Amino acid sequence: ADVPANLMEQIHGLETLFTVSSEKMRSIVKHFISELDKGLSKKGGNIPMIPGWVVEYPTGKETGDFLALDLGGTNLRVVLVKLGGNHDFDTTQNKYRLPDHLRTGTSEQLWSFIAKCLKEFVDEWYPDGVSEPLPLGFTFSYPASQKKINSGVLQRWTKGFDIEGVEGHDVVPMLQEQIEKLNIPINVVALINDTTGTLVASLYTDPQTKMGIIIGTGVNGAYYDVVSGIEKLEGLLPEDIGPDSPMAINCEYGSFDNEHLVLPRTKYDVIIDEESPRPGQQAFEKMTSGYYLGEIMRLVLLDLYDSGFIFKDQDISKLKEAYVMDTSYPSKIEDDPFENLEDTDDLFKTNLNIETTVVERKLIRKLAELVGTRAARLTVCGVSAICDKRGYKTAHIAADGSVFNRYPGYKEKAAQALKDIYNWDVEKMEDHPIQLVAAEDGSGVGAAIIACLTQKRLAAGKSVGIKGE
């Protein structure tokens, strides 16, 4: 199969629509820097820039036993972390099904069950008893605000959870109360977002870590800023958190560029946005999340069908369905090792009921590569904005999420993206001054380490939040 001229011209067209140059990346990074700055100076810039209330770097010399509680859709995960003091740690964990009848929810049965689980865990791993109370970090992945690290006021339940009387209430004393009633030796000392945990856990084992990044269905970034650079906290901070203090920031930068000033959206991206549940929101996420990569390809193929280029005489009644193509499509297609692209052929015939020619499959494959590479290039603009804003010339960027972990070539695409931005003369990725590395476990390990850092301050009578809180 040699690609017909009319189809080659379309592929060149797709390349012009979807490729992101070095220079464009650099202009996007520049806008991203002042949007991060703006989020730090004011409540409600499009980038939240949420203080995470971690005000020290882990040194890697911390030792001792620390717990984490990771509360999930159908599971509660309880993690014990043993910190070895040399950037090292051992871990063990249990998961507990949350019972059917109490997601539907009394606040007090929810916490009694979480407590009963922690009791079971503590009795199994400390059968002789614990000398001292174990500090616990709580990854609580539901909309919440906190004015100190040892607090989480739930804005709203999510994910089938409908428990009355939790919303508008701090969950920490609710949970702490049931722990005390069971006479379990645990204190709940921190509530975090998982990405904040991804940064701190990775930094403990890897001191070059300068950022924790999630690239999945959702996108998030966390890094350490400095207090003198967080204008929106001026007048709010107690005496022992001064201008020199570090501050962990949970970015929530998915809303970056909602104004649509800098992202190179194509007509296909504009459709995804208009058709989404929230047009004009989540702009950066829409352009980088693995969730939309298949819908992008679908709209493109449908457009080429509609203009006469491809799928002639085919049944497009499945192709016409929004979100029929999930992230597994560009993923499988990029992974297709066959010269004649047989995995691509199977996917389209079987799932979409479309028979393809080899030349169509070559176009489809080129398109998957374009969409995936674009996603990665835009993601690293977030990475480069944090680094450039903070004057980090070298960095380990601790990454997680189903896209970073599972999408074909993702790490090679990101690394080439950084290398083009900074224009390095370095042959191999492993040697890039700024590189993406596999994160440590954020929601588990990360929470327990944060619980460690927080305890250092509390034990000292030192503040971990806004004055008078």
Short summary of the structure?
Helix content is 42%, strand content 17%. It has helices at residues 5-18, 22-41, 100-103, 107-125, 171-181, 194-205, 267-275, 283-288, 293-306, 328-335, 342-352, 358-390, 402-406, 410-422, 442-459; strands at 50-51, 63-71, 75-84, 89-97, 134-140, 144-145, 153-154, 186-192, 209-215, 219-226, 246-250, 395-400, 434-438. It is globular and about 75 Å long.
Give the topology string: H per helix, E per strand. HHEEEEHHEEEHEHEEEHHHHHHEHHEH
Strand order, largest beta sheet: 1-11-10-9-12-13
Determine and state the CATH class of the largest domain: Alpha Beta
Number of helix segments?
15
Supply Rg: 24 Å
For the largest beta-sheet, the strand count, sense and barrel status come to: 6 strands, mixed
Shape: globular
Give the CATH topology of the largest domain.
Hexokinase, domain 1
Number of strands: 13
- Percent strand equals 15-25%
In total, how many domains does the architecture comprise? 3
Structural class: alpha/beta
Helix content: 40-55%
Distance between the termini: 69 Å
Instruction: Report the CATH architecture of the largest domain.
Output: 3-Layer(aba) Sandwich
